[PDB]
Each structure stands twice: as C-alpha cells, then as structure tokens.
RNA sequence: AGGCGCGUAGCUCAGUAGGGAGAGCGCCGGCCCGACACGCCGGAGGUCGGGGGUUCAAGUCCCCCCGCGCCU
C-alpha cells in the first residue's frame, strides 16, 4: 500500500508517542513491502518546522501533488467554502471579544497568546488549513493509497473526497503487523 | 450563455448603468437571443436582499434559476490549491490584524471605534480577493459547467473564474455587451 | 421552454387562487394560457392519475390532455447521482426516528387521556408532518423529479420537498406562486 | 475478488457464529490476510461498527486488510427506477408505521400499561420501517462501494441484499463467507 | 402533434360510438377531424391489415389512406429496455399458468357435464381473458408500441395491455374516449 | 473468457452426466474445472434462486459462490432490439393458440371417455410442451439472456428456446454437451 | 408536405391505370392533372423512368411528365439499409433459386419424354419467372424505388407484391395502389 | 440483524402415503322427564391466514407475503 503520510503523523507529540521516533518508525516502515509516498511540499514544511533525514528520505518518496491531472468535486469545494465563512466569523467574534476585554483591562502579554490560540483553533482546526494539506489530499486521491494523518480537518476532508483512512494511533501497529 | 450573479443587480452602479433596471434587463434579455443562468443560492440571496417587485415573475422567464449540479461537476485541483494558499495567507493577515487591534485598544477608551475598525479590516482581509459566500462558489460552478461568462463585480470571483478557466466579462459594458448581441 | 407540471399546480389552494379563483376554472385558464405561450408542458402519468383521482373536472380533461404531455419519466435511460440517494436516506433515517419518538409520546399521553379521537388526529397530523414534509414522500414526486431531469425542464411544483430535492440535483425551478405570470408574459 | 463488507457481518450473532465477536474478528482477519482478496468497508459503516461494539486493540490490525474509505459518490450514479421503487416501498412502510402507531395508541387508551406497550410499539415500528429496506446511510455506502468496485456484497441485512440485487451487485451468502474464505485460501 | 392509432380507435364498440353511430361513418367523421388538426396520425401496417381484415368498409379506405400514414416501425433502429421484456415474460408466465389451471378445471367439469359445447365456449372465453386481457397479446400491439416510441407520438387505444405497457415503456398516453374532443380542440 | 451459466448446466440430466455422475459430484467437479480456468463464470440471481428451489446439496453451495458470480443482469443500462420483442410476441401468440386448442381437445375427450386422472396429466404435458418448449418461458431465462448480452459472455444452456433466442440477440453460444471438454483444455 | 415515390407498375399494370382513365396513355394525362393539382411532391428513380420509356411509350406527354414527377437517383451514397434486411433478402433468394432449379429439372424431364418443347419453353419460362422474380425484389429498379422512398420518407406507390413486402420491412409508408387515384383525388 | 413456534367450526385444540375437513367444549332440533336439568341422539358449527407452484388429488410438500407471540 502506498501510504501517503503527512507531517502531522511525523512531527507531533501524539504521533511520536504512537509511532527521535523516526528511527523507531523506519525500523518497520521500510519493511512490510509498503511503499510510503509523502508529498514534497509536506516534506519542505516539515523541514521548516523541525528535523538521518537523508535516510528518512530513502523510504518515503517526496513526490509532487500532480494537480495538473487531478480534479476535485464541486461539492468538495462548496463544503469547504461553507465552513470557511463560519470559521472566519468565529475568528472575527473572538477578535471582537478580545478587543472588548482589552478596552477595560490592559494586559497585552496575556491577551496576545490567548487571541493567537483562539484564532488558530477557530480558523485552522477542523478544516484544511494550508496548501501542504491540499497537496497531501490530492496525492492520496491520485495514488489511491492510505492517508495516515492526525488533523481532524484533513481526515474529514479525505473521507468526504473518497480517500482511504487508517487510524494514526494504529499506523505503528498496522505497519508492524504486515 | 451569461452566468449572472447578485452583484449585477444588487449593486446600484450596475443597476443605474442599464424596478426599472430589472424591467430593462428583462426586456433586453428576452429579445437578445441569449441564455442567462443565475444559481439558486445567489438568486435566493438577491431576493432576500432586494424587493424589486413585479419583475421576479419576468426574470424567471429570462434567467434560468438552477443549481450548478455539483454532483456532476469537477473543479480543477489547481484552483483548490490556489484558494487554499490565498486563504492561509489571508488567515495569517487577519490574525496579525486582530493582534494589532488588541494591542492598540489598550490606549483607547472608545470601543465603538476600535471594534468597527477591526470589523472593517477583517471584512476586507478575509472576504476580499477570494470566494467568501457559497453563492459565489455556486456562480463559479454554474459558469464552469455550462461554459458561460461569469458576469459579476467582485474581484475575487473574477480571479477564481480566470484561474479555473471560465471566460469573464465586464459589468460596466455588460449592458453594452447585451445590447450588441441583441 | 419545458415546464414539468405537478399535482400541486392544480390542487394547492393558493396555486389555484393565483390561477383564476375556482379550482375548475384554474385548470381552464391554464389550458387557455398554455395552448398559447408556445411552451411544452409535461406531467408524469402517475401524477396525472393521482391528480385525476383527487379532483374530477369532467369534460375538461379532454382539453387538458392536449397541451400537457402525460408520460412516464423513461427511468431506464435515466440516472440519478449517488450523493442524492445518500442525502435522501440520511434525512429519511432522522425523520423515521422522529416519527417513532412522536408516536411514543402520543401513546404515553393517551395512556391517561380520556378523549382519544383528538389525540389520534394529532398523531396523524404530526406523523405526516414529520415524515412526509420536506422529502420525496411518494413516487409521484419522484416521477415529476425524473421527468424534469431528463427533459432539462423547469420543475413547477408547490411542494417544498420536491423543490428542495430538485435543487439538489440541478433542475431548474420556478416560483409556483407567480407561474401564471411567467406564463402570461410568454404568450 | 473484492468483498465489500457491512456491519452485519460482525454484528449479527449467526454470522460470527459461522466464523464471540472478539474471536470472530481474529479468525476473519486470519482468513482475510491470506485470501488475496480486497475487503472494502465504508467509513461511515466503520464508524457505526466501532460505536456498536468495541474490540480490544484488534482495530489496528483490522484497518489494513479491511480497507476503509467512502464510496466516492460524486463519480457514481444510481438508476432512476431504483429510487422510484425505493420511495414507493418507503411510502408503503411509512403508512404501515402510521397504522401501527394508531393501533398501539388506541389499544393503550384502555390498557393503563405503557412500560411494555412502548417497547412493543418500538419493535413493530422498527420491523415495519427498517427491515427489508435501506434505512441508514451506511447501507447506501455499502451499496455504492460494492457498485463502484464491482463488489461482492457480504451482509446479513436482507434489505441490503434485495436492494443490491436491483442494482446488479454480486451477492454472497453471509452464512458461507467463512467457508468461502477457506476455499479461496486453498 | 403525432398520434399513433390502434385498431380499437375504429373497431372497439365504444370509441367509434363516441365518434358517430356504427363503425362506418365513425371513421368518416374521424377523417373529417383528422385532416383538420395538422397532427400526424400514424398506424402500423400490420395493425392496418388486421383491422381491415376485421372491418371491411368500402371506399372509405381511399380517403383513410391519405390521413393515417400506414407504416411499420423501423425495428432495426429501435431498441427496448431489458426490464421491459423481463416484466413482460414474468407476468406472462403467471398468465400461462392461469390458463393451464382454467383448462384443468374445465376438463374436470366436462368429465361430469352434458352441455359440453357451452363448456368449450366458457373455456374459450376464460382462456382468452386470462392470457390476453391486460397484456400485449399480438404483434399488432408491439407494432403500435414501437411506432409510438420511435415517433415520440401519442398512443390512442382502449387496450389495457397497450396502455399499461406504453406507460412502462415511456409513451405519451391519452384517454381514447377524449381523443375525439382532442381532435376538435386541435382543429379549434 | 466469460461463461454465463444456466440452471440446465447442473440440473438437466445430460449435462451433469457429462459432468461426472450423481449430480452432487457434478457440481464438485464443475467448480474444480472452473477454479483453474480463469474463465469468469456468471449466473443471474433469479436463476440461482430457482436452482436452490429445484436442487439442494448443502455445503457445496459454500464453494459454488467462489467460482460462479451471482448478480442481476443490470437491466437498467441494458437494451434489447425491437424486432426481438416482435418475434417473441408473435411466436408466443401462436403457442398460446395451440395451448388453447390442446385444452379444448382434452375437454372434449373428457366429455365422453373416462379416467380423468391421467387425462389431466396428459393435458399438463401437452400444454407445457406447446407453451414453454422452444421459447423463453421464465424471467430466469430472460435474466440469463441479459447477463450474457451485457457481459458479451458465453451462454451455456441446454434449453432450446434459450439458445434459439440468444442466437437472435448476438450472444456467443456453445454446445452444453461440450462445455466440460471446453473447460478441460481451457485450464 | 406529402411526397409519393412512384413506380413503373403504377402506369403499366392494367388494373392500376384502369383506376385512372382507360388505356396506358390517357391514364398518364389524367394522372398529370390530378398530381399537378394535388400540390404534393411526386418522385420516381431514373432507372425506373428509363424502363418506363422503354417498356411503354407516349409522344409529347413526357414533356409534361417531367414536370410533376421528379426523376432522380435515390442518392444512395448517403443512405444505409439494415443488415437484417439484406440477410432476409438473400435467405429468401436461396429458396427461390432452389425452386427455380427444381422447376428447370422437371421441365427438362418432361421434354425428355414428351417431344413438345414448343409450348414447354413458354411454360418453363413462366414457371421460372414466377419462381424467382415474383413477390421479391428482382431488379435494381425496385431497389431504387425502395431507396428513394426511404431517403424521402415518402409513400411507395406500387402494384408489386414484392416491392410492397420489402418496403414494409424497412419502414416505408405504403399505400394501396388501387385507391392511389383516390388518395390524390380527395387530397386535392 | 436475525431465529423459532402457531394461524384449523362460535372457543380450545387434533389430523397428514398428500386419499376424511374432525374431536372436546359451545348453540339449536330431538330425547327420559310436566318441561327445563343429566343422559341420550342429530342438525347447524370452515377462506384449514393470503397468494403462487407441484400433484390424479394440498390444511399437509416447496416459495413468497401478513398476523399473533416468544424471542437473545
């Protein structure tokens, strides 16, 4: 199986505990005859995030999204655009509440982190956040492989697009059982 | 095959370019030997944001209110990637704007101005230059499926239609365009 | 253009109040304005039989069968998107659960209640509201939907479930209340 | 050999008898890993299968042999007569259910008993509205995933069987699936 | 605009009764109202030949050939759904079994009966009812069905088999008792 | 290679006599020949149901499903020539008239003669030979025809009516007495 | 609106031109008046027209026959016929050829014993011609009539049993040649 | 998700090579008795739940569908 693993399954506390952890993963991921194939943009974003790397690049092939030959359903974009309005409005309401709180009391160093967390939770959790996730979705919908990841939005979009999903907390056990 | 939108009739500028603008548009389209297709969502939004009266029963005989049939359409993945990148950039910009507004609100005693400024910044950073309403996506899909001209006024809709591959038009000359083809 | 008619176009009180003022005269004015306007009007045979079994206009059915082309949707050469069936079943399961729950509440209320005909009427009305409003309730609505789909015509209906599920397919929809005015202008 | 699976394969008592649910999962996996077949259960069916029963740590090994994915309904189509027949029979049942509710309420009027009669009404309503026809969207997912893959539908749900037959889906006897996997492995 | 005519339009005791009195003259007024409506009236050649074999009016055929376009369906360029033939065969099996049952009961009744000629007549009537009423029986029916299907025309017949299978196949049906009034309103 | 199987392949004495003996080893050896053939055998669901009604082995049906694929012919996407229906209806009319003649002859011979018990059996034989021998006589046969037509597969059946009406469609036919030897070398 | 594709048998076969004014020549002139007034569109293929001018002959009447009846080839390069049509044609031709051979054998054997070949030659000619060329397409003229009626979707007017029979198998509108006079008369 | 059992007179139930539509209990006409009671007889007492097949013959055997329940 061509497992299309994203960065959420490679660099994350839950991902690392379930599967530093790169060596313990590659102990059996390169085995079991499963040709993992990660996106190239996902690899670049992971490298920008955090990081033997040349050996980890010798198992999962960093391929291109190949969006030229790929097409997306119209409903798959309508459902994204419908949730985008709700997420943006929730973020705007959170910002308005933060401004109202700052009007009365003044704590910049405590309000800035809270506002950043609220924005990142209400506008980047539960939906496709970046282009590095759309690339993974397109690669999975093109290679017809597994879509091991941990993002709720990525999983709920891959399920709505027809991609196959395998439990991230079970990816290590699945790879070790094949 | 002109895929109309709400901007072509809700905007006072486009209406004045032509209850009178609707009648003139109906009379022009009913004799221009042309097809007009307005999505059901966009038409519902326009009818809930307009009260033209006595012309909704004549625009139905000129325009064709129908859904873009998203079940059969297939948007290119390149447009999705471009929209995702633009949305991520706009989300980062909106978060930065919200942080700046929160920082600036410390020294201000009138929330009625800071909140309004934040709302204006958000409605132009996260809802301009990209598709924002489901009606816009419906218009784009209806134009792409029927291979028509996405007559509208929003810049984000025009940019998305150009990226997808749908031929665009100019609302300024839209009345002139329908006048020549009549 | 092609107008796919329905039973609600001739049976709904408001629809035959915009169509003249009497239900019999409504269909006669429909014949008057549909023999004109140079348009094509279609109704499924099942819908036609149900509508003819609801009301009886007599000798006007002869003039009615002319302009309205009564025929089956030709479902063998027709197809429906799978997402449509998915969404219909998803809504239907919820409405079935709602109907079962309201039946339970009505039974528990009638346990101690004295008057029973009133509660039986309440159960009937609430059940037909919770299970036959908002979706495709009969295969007559399905026939109207499919005839509109294959003809690329405008589904003329006052039923809200029919209009909703025609929109979710991609069928052109008209506003039933003013349909006489889309008809009067065409002539 | 592509085998689209349902909840009923591991939810029905007789089907895992012809295989304990925990042991049945393991024997099915044993026979499915080396069957050289392609087992495809839908994602919504998988979610409801997780919700009805929980098996300890066997989901991890379940997930790779039994591929889990959505039917991809945007590229699939269903015959018009299929929906026509479904909604005709659906109307029929809905009516039957209304009559059952009327019967139970009118006989509950002079009975004073509700604790057993509510259960009887539940059973009659479920029998008259959800047995022999497609009820959940999970059934539709199994149907369409077998239709797209030209799949063998393995299910103990008689409604799923009789409505997959109307589509053209290769149907199988769920009581023979284990001894089918036997011969397939051999 | 396109009406496909069966034999019942001019031979059934009721349809010609609506048009006029008696089989003759009814077809005459039908012609009067048919060359006046601009519609395209059609009937298959087999149906025409068998109808002429049933009713043998004289010179009326001369002006009848002008209006009704006698024409066999182009069955080579026509197709019928698989489910249509499936349903036809499935129902016909039941009808054949019913006819066999009727035959057995009539044989057993005649085993102890004296007026065997009238028993034979009743067996004839019951067999004809059980095997040919409510279903397409002759190739005339199939020819009418295909002629209406290919032309996208309006089938006019008082045969319940014709109507109930034209409905299954997708042909615009019409009430044969109102078709004279339809001709009048098409003229006017 | 695709073979669309009938009921006669494993129920009619001649074919299952070529396919070994006892009719229970027949299916066993058939499946055998089918396993190492890569020949994609098929059977319609209705024919399989009638098979299970007529014959019942037990645990051989366990391995019957692995080689033979049972599914409906997908009649919604299939079409049949109009001339086929025309010919079928005309021949069926002839056979119905012959059956009525047989009935009205046996009634007359019951009028005068005796022993109606064997007379009924003779009437049954003559009627079922006049109406069902040499023509399509069940929807199972129609399903076999349609599944062979859609798949462009080989129709294996000793029914003379099935072969005769499959030839008129364009279905690759085969001698049912040679299917075993066909299967032997196809390995 | 209505187009008739004429044949040679229309004005050559005794009965058909006897429906018009008598004699093969006056019937032509009366048909000319009736067809000119009808405002229809009559046609006949070129080969059939040549066989007309050869088998029959009039002077200064074809100068008027050229106008109403439009003589042209059926334009056969843009036309097709069903495969089953040719299949049935050659199937029937095989039987006719075998029967003609048997007739020839029987007449040779009759001439063997009876030395009266003078009338036997005529009898054999009549039987052979009836055996292979009666009631079937037997000349490219008939094929041209068929194809000109098929391309125009017109009314085939002919007294030939074979031409009508084989036009019925392809979907050509047919008429009774013995009232075709009155098809035109009431049409005017 | 399915499984089993039973629908037979007014009630409760037997019946099977597939060769009868019954028993007990009811109701009436008889009958000892003034007459009802008891006994003693008989008559009335059928969609064998429905449809489809097979048979010479079906409540019986096969298929499907309803109802009643028990169901785990």
Q: 3-state class of G70 per DSSP?
A: strand
Contacting residues of B for A133, CB less than 8 Å apart: 84
Neighbours of G52 (CB within 10 A): 24
CA distance to A24, A167, A170, A171, G55, per residue, from A177 (Å):
14, 14, 10, 10, 94
The contacts of residue G89 (CB under 8 Å, 6+ apart) are: G136, G137, G166
Number of H helices, E strands in chain G: 9, 5
Q: E182 vs C71: CB contact, 8 Å cut-off? A: no
Q: A167 vs D69: CB contact, 8 Å cut-off? A: no
Question: Is residue C134 within 8 Å of residue C167, measured between CB atoms?
Answer: no
Residue with tokens 């396993």: F35
CA distance D77 to chain B (A): 9
Nearest to D176 among F61, F69, F73 (CB): F61
Dist. CA A121–CA B18, nearest whole Å: 46
Q: What token pair was written down for A23?
A: 């060596």
Specify burial of residue D106 (Cβ count, 10 A radius: 0-12, 13-18, 19+).
middle
Nearest to B71 among C84, C173, C178 (CB): C84
Q: What token pair was written down for G187?
A: 């049409």
Phi, psi of G107 (to 5 degrees): -70, -35
Specify burial of residue D66 (Cβ count, 10 A radius: 0-12, 13-18, 19+).
buried
CA distance to D73, D87, F181, per residue, from A83 (Å):
21, 32, 64
Strand H contacts (Cβ < 7 A) comprise D 7-8, 11-14, 96, 103, 120, 123-124, 126, 128, 130-132, 135-136, 156-159; E 93-94, 97-98, 100-101, 104; F 53, 116-118, 120-121, 124, 128
**Of F42, F48, F50, residue with least CA distance to F61:** F48
Task: For Cα atoms E134, E138, E140, give the angle at the middle one, nearest 5 degrees.
Answer: 110
How large is the angle between the packed helices E179-187 and C60-67, nearest 10 degrees?
70
DSSP strands (E only) in chain C: 2-4, 40-43, 68-70, 79-81, 154-155, 172-173
The contacts of residue C135 (CB under 8 Å, 6+ apart) are: C88, C91, C92, C95, C161, C165
CA distance D147 to chain C (A): 10
What is the side-by-side strand order in the sheet with G41-44? G70-71, G41-44, G3-5, G155-156, G173-174
| Helix/strand/coil percent split, chain D, to 5 | 65, 10, 25
Residue with tokens 């967390």: A117
What's the start-to-end Cα distance of chain F, in Å? 12
C-alpha F34 chain-centroid distance: 19
What's the start-to-end Cα distance of chain C, in Å? 12
**Of A132, A136, A146, A169, residue with least CA distance to A3:** A146
What's the start-to-end Cα distance of chain G, in Å? 13
| DSSP H/E element including A67 | none
C-alpha E115 chain-centroid distance: 34
Question: Is residue A91 within 8 Å of residue B94, measured between CB atoms?
Answer: yes
Q: Give the CA radius of gyration of chain B.
A: 19
CA distance F131 to chain E (A): 8
DSSP B130: S
For B72, the closest chain D residue by CA position comes to D74
Interface residues of B toward D, Cβ cutoff 8 Å, are 70-72, 74
Phi, psi of A129 (to 5 degrees): -90, -60
CA of F97 to C1' of H58 (A): 30
What is the side-by-side strand order in the sheet with C172-173? C68-70, C40-43, C2-4, C154-155, C172-173
Q: Give the DSSP letter string of A139-172.
A: HHHHHT-B-----HHHHHHHHHHT-B---HHHHH
Question: Is residue E13 within 8 Å of residue E19, measured between CB atoms?
Answer: no
Q: What token pair was written down for E155?
A: 């089938």
CA of D156 to C1' of H14 (A): 38
| DSSP H/E element including A132 | helix A131-143
Strand partners, F70: F43
**Of C170, C165, C154, C30, residue with least CA distance to B61:** C154
Neighbours of D140 (CB within 10 A): 27
Task: For Cα atoms B16, B18, B22, give the angle at the middle one, nearest 5 degrees.
Answer: 90
Q: What token pair was written down for D184?
A: 């397939």
What's the start-to-end Cα distance of chain D, in Å? 14
CB under 8 Å, gap of 24 or more: what pairs does C113-120 form? C113/D109, C116/D105, C116/D106, C116/D109, C119/D105, C120/D102, C120/D105, C120/D106
Please report, to the nearest 10 degrees, the dihedral formed by the alpha carbons of residues B109, B111, B117, B120 taken in order: 180
Contacting residues of C for F146, CB less than 8 Å apart: none
For D175, the closest chain F residue by CA position comes to F62
Residue with tokens 């005859």: A33
Dist. CA D132–CA D134, nearest whole Å: 7
Neighbours of F49 (CB within 10 A): 14
Neighbours of C50 (CB within 10 A): 16
DSSP C5: -
Q: 3-state class of D77 per DSSP?
A: strand
CA of D168 to C1' of H49 (A): 35
Neighbours of G162 (CB within 10 A): 17
What's the start-to-end Cα distance of chain A, in Å? 10
Q: 3-state class of D89 per DSSP?
A: helix
CA of D106 to C1' of H12 (A): 28
Question: Is residue C164 within 8 Å of residue C91, measured between CB atoms?
Answer: no
Query: Residue F134, by phi and psi: left (phi above 0), alpha (psi -120 to 50) or beta?
Result: left
Task: Give me the half-sphere count of Cα atoms (radius 13 Å) on the Cβ side of residue C24.
Answer: 5
Return the partners of chain D (3 or more C-beta pairs < 8 Å): A, B, C, F
Phi, psi of C29 (to 5 degrees): -65, -30
Query: Is the Cα dihedral D44, D46, D49, D53 positive or negative?
Result: negative
Interface residues of B toward C, Cβ cutoff 8 Å, are 40, 56-58, 60-61, 64-72
CA distance to C95, D102, D171, E55, E154, per residue, from C120 (Å):
19, 7, 43, 60, 46
Q: What token pair was written down for D178?
A: 């284990």
How large is the angle between the packed helices B155-164 and B134-146, nearest 10 degrees?
40
CB under 8 Å, gap of 24 or more: what pairs does B10-15 form? B10/B46, B10/B49, B10/B50, B11/B153, B11/B171, B13/B153, B14/B153, B14/B171, B14/B174
Return the partners of chain C (3 or more C-beta pairs < 8 Å): B, D, E, F
Contacting residues of G for E72, CB less than 8 Å apart: 168-169, 171
Length of chain A measured in residues: 178
**Of F92, F100, F94, residue with least CA distance to E106:** F100
Provide the b/e sequence for A157-172 (b: ≥16 CB within 10 Å): bbbbbbbbbbbbebbb
Strand partners, D77: C81
CA distance E168 to chain C (A): 7
Task: For Cα atoms E24, E28, E32, give the angle at the middle one, nearest 5 degrees.
Answer: 165
Q: What token pair was written down for C46?
A: 């099942």
Neighbours of G125 (CB within 10 A): 11
Phi, psi of D67 (to 5 degrees): -70, 140
Query: Is the Cα dihedral A133, A135, A136, A141 positive or negative?
Result: positive
Q: Give the DSSP letter string of chain F.
A: --EEE-SHHHHSHHHHHHS-STTTHHHHHHHHHHHTT---EEE-HHHHHHHHHH---STHHHHHHHHSEE----TTS-EEEHHHHHHHHHHHHHHHHHHHHHHHHHHHHHHHS--HHHHHHHHHHHHHHHHHSSS--SHHHHHHHHHHHHHT-EEE---HHHHHHHHTTT-EE--GGGHHHHHHHH-
Dist. CA C7–CA C17, nearest whole Å: 15
Residue with tokens 């089989």: E23
**Of G131, G186, F103, A176, residue with least CA distance to F95:** F103
Question: Is residue E76 within 8 Å of residue E187, measured between CB atoms?
Answer: no
Dist. CA D164–CA D145, nearest whole Å: 11
Specify burial of residue E134 (Cβ count, 10 A radius: 0-12, 13-18, 19+).
middle
DSSP A63: B
CA distance to D118, G106, G163, per residue, from E43 (Å):
62, 45, 20
Q: How was this structure determined?
A: cryo-EM
Q: What token pair was written down for A116?
A: 């950043």
**Of D10, D31, D30, residue with least CA distance to D21:** D10
Phi, psi of G137 (to 5 degrees): -60, 115
Q: What token pair was written down for G140?
A: 């490219």
CA distance to B17, B30, D141, D168, per residue, from D161 (Å):
62, 52, 13, 11
């Amino acid at each position: 199986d061509v497992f299309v693993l994203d960065t959420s399954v490679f660099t994350n506390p839950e991902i690392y505990r379930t599967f530093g952890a790169m060596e313990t993963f590659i102990h059996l991921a390169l085995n079991s005859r499963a040709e993992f194939y990660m996106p190239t943009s996902v690899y670049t974003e992971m490298r920008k995030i955090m990081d033997l790397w040349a050996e980890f690049e010798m198992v999962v092939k960093i391929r291109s999204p190949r969006r030229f030959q790929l097409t997306v359903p119209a409903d798959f974009l309508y459902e994204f655009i419908e949730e985008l309005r709700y997420r943006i409005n929730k973020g705007l309401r959170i910002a308005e509440e933060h401004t109202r709180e700052a009007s009365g009391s003044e704590d910049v160093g405590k309000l800035i982190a809270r506002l950043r967390e609220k924005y990142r939770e209400a506008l980047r959790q539960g939906i496709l956040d970046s282009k590095e996730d759309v690339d993974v979705l397109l690669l999975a919908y093109e290679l017809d492989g597994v879509l091991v990841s941990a993002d709720e939005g990525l999983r709920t979009w891959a399920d709505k697009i027809g991609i196959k999903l395998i439990d991230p907390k079970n990816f290590k056990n699945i790879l070790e059982s094949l």
